[PDB]
Design a protein around this ligand. Sequence first.
Ligand code: V7A
Ligand code: MG
Ligand code: MG
Ligand code: MG
Ligand code: MG
Ligand code: MG
Ligand code: MG
Ligand code: MG
Ligand code: MG
Ligand code: MG
Ligand code: MG
Ligand code: MG
Ligand code: MG
Ligand code: MG
Ligand code: MG
Ligand code: MG
Ligand code: MG
Ligand code: MG
Ligand code: MG
Ligand code: MG
Ligand code: MG
Ligand code: MG
Ligand code: MG
Ligand code: MG
Ligand code: MG
Ligand code: MG
Ligand code: MG
Ligand code: MG
Ligand code: MG
Ligand code: MG
Ligand code: MG
Ligand code: MG
Ligand code: MG
Ligand code: MG
Ligand code: MG
Ligand code: MG
Ligand code: MG
Ligand code: ZN
Ligand code: ZN
Lengths: 60, 50, 67, 144
Amino acid sequence: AAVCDICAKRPGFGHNVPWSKKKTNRRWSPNIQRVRVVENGTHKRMNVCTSCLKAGRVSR
Amino acid sequence: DVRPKITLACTECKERNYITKKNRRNNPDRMEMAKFCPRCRKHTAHRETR
Amino acid sequence: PKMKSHSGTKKRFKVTGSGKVTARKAGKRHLNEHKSSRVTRRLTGETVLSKGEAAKVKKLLAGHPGR
Amino acid sequence: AIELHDLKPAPGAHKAKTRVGRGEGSKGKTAGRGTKGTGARKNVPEFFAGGQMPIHMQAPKLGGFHNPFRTEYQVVNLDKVEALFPKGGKITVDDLVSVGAVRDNELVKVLGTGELTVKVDLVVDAWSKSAQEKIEKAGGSVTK
RNA sequence: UGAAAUUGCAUUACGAGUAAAGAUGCUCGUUACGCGCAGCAGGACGGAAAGACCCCGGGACCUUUACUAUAGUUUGGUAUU
RNA sequence: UUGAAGAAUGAGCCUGCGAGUUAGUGAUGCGUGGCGAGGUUAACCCGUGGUGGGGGAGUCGUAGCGAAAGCGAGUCCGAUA
Ligand SMILES: CON(C)Cc1ccc(O)c2c1C[C@H]1C[C@H]3[C@H](N(C)C)C(O)=C(C(N)=O)C(=O)[C@@]3(O)C(O)=C1C2=O
Ligand SMILES: [Mg+2]
Ligand SMILES: [Mg+2]
Ligand SMILES: [Mg+2]
Ligand SMILES: [Mg+2]
Ligand SMILES: [Mg+2]
Ligand SMILES: [Mg+2]
Ligand SMILES: [Mg+2]
Ligand SMILES: [Mg+2]
Ligand SMILES: [Mg+2]
Ligand SMILES: [Mg+2]
Ligand SMILES: [Mg+2]
Ligand SMILES: [Mg+2]
Ligand SMILES: [Mg+2]
Ligand SMILES: [Mg+2]
Ligand SMILES: [Mg+2]
Ligand SMILES: [Mg+2]
Ligand SMILES: [Mg+2]
Ligand SMILES: [Mg+2]
Ligand SMILES: [Mg+2]
Ligand SMILES: [Mg+2]
Ligand SMILES: [Mg+2]
Ligand SMILES: [Mg+2]
Ligand SMILES: [Mg+2]
Ligand SMILES: [Mg+2]
Ligand SMILES: [Mg+2]
Ligand SMILES: [Mg+2]
Ligand SMILES: [Mg+2]
Ligand SMILES: [Mg+2]
Ligand SMILES: [Mg+2]
Ligand SMILES: [Mg+2]
Ligand SMILES: [Mg+2]
Ligand SMILES: [Mg+2]
Ligand SMILES: [Mg+2]
Ligand SMILES: [Mg+2]
Ligand SMILES: [Mg+2]
Ligand SMILES: [Mg+2]
Ligand SMILES: [Zn+2]
Ligand SMILES: [Zn+2]
């Protein structure tokens, strides 16, 4: 996945820019990790970005 | 390559006043000339830069 | 819409008080060692364009007064 | 008592519009373009020179720079000062040279091509050395 | 009962010439009454398709150790750890 | 088109239609009108009454020369040549 279930981080779109500068469309995906979470009392998977995982916005 | 461009700078005000050509094989060492230095405003010894 | 002036013409040509068009002499940017001081003196000045070239430059400048 | 039907333009004030491509008794058929070629259909750009390196590329760029904070001195001359203040202008000022002509809201430098037979006190922004010399020679002064 | 392609024109001969170098139409001559019907294909450089060959301009697709890029595959770093 | 009555192109015929336009307070001339060392407003405001009045912010002319500091009927290169 490339969308964070927390903070809704989503891919950006930009350019491959070679030495000749012949720009080509490309994507920057967020570092989405699928981890086990225990929310309230629910065990389930969630696709969580590493930024949220580092900030602790996700309960494991 | 065999007759490179050499730059004569005054030995007083170290100013690259002139540029010319030598032979490298006929004149391997740096060349000494008395040329007019505009800054020094007279004739000063000019030496090829290293 | 307003007419844009030619960028190279702006950067390269001047217009005098009396409407003359002048440019800088060409051929003195490099390779100056073999050139005599007389040649460099001939190339170091400011040249006045011919009538046709001056008219073309004035058309290229969209009323720009030159550099 | 002109009445609207007596209003006519001055002779030569309304040149007839030339209408092209309307018969061979006028600019007809080819419409003043000749036969074939680029010019038969569109134009040629003024920067184009036929593939030869054009003048605006062969001429070297005048280098240099512009002063970002350059101020331009509105200039007035002693001829103009004498003409517009003939009755021995005692104290000319920026407002006075503006009501004559200096294009106000600018600095009002005074230059010295002229004679200045009268005595005058300029009170302006900057002046040339020759202008100042002529002014004190006539008996006047400058300030600011 | 009833089309068609075609069609600058018309009261649309031949010979030897001449001319954008191959003429019903120009020159010099020769021949020929007016109009139809069935036929034949030598010519009208016959009709049909803005030559499909050639060259010049543009395009397309194809190829490769042409150029510049890229999906993919692969290397290591780093995050997840 | 060097050259076409051309056996080079297009047109069967008539009627209708079918190609140098318009916009910029564009660029540059000219004619003409106004004002004139001055000329001119843009947005907008008023006139629900319009095509008129206001609005001078700006903008061009008023000094040039220099890369520029700058100097200035001079300036720049130069040695106050
Ligand atoms: C052996 O040499 N002889 C003299 C030639 C020739 C002989 C017998 C034939 O049967 C054909 C041809 C020529 C070709 C030309 C082809 C061409 N195409 C391939 C690009 C074209 O341009 C068209 C077209 N529609 O214009 C065609 O007709 C085409 O496809 C076709 O079918 C052809 C034939 O039939
Ligand atoms: Mg693109
Ligand atoms: Mg960490
Ligand atoms: Mg240089
Ligand atoms: Mg030299
Ligand atoms: Mg004609
Ligand atoms: Mg015609
Ligand atoms: Mg013409
Ligand atoms: Mg034509
Ligand atoms: Mg034509
Ligand atoms: Mg032609
Ligand atoms: Mg032509
Ligand atoms: Mg032309
Ligand atoms: Mg263009
Ligand atoms: Mg070339
Ligand atoms: Mg012949
Ligand atoms: Mg014959
Ligand atoms: Mg005949
Ligand atoms: Mg006849
Ligand atoms: Mg018959
Ligand atoms: Mg028959
Ligand atoms: Mg036949
Ligand atoms: Mg045929
Ligand atoms: Mg063809
Ligand atoms: Mg074909
Ligand atoms: Mg065919
Ligand atoms: Mg191609
Ligand atoms: Mg195809
Ligand atoms: Mg990896
Ligand atoms: Mg790793
Ligand atoms: Mg021909
Ligand atoms: Mg014909
Ligand atoms: Mg014919
Ligand atoms: Mg043809
Ligand atoms: Mg036809
Ligand atoms: Mg028709
Ligand atoms: Mg103002
Ligand atoms: Zn997130
Ligand atoms: Zn020296």
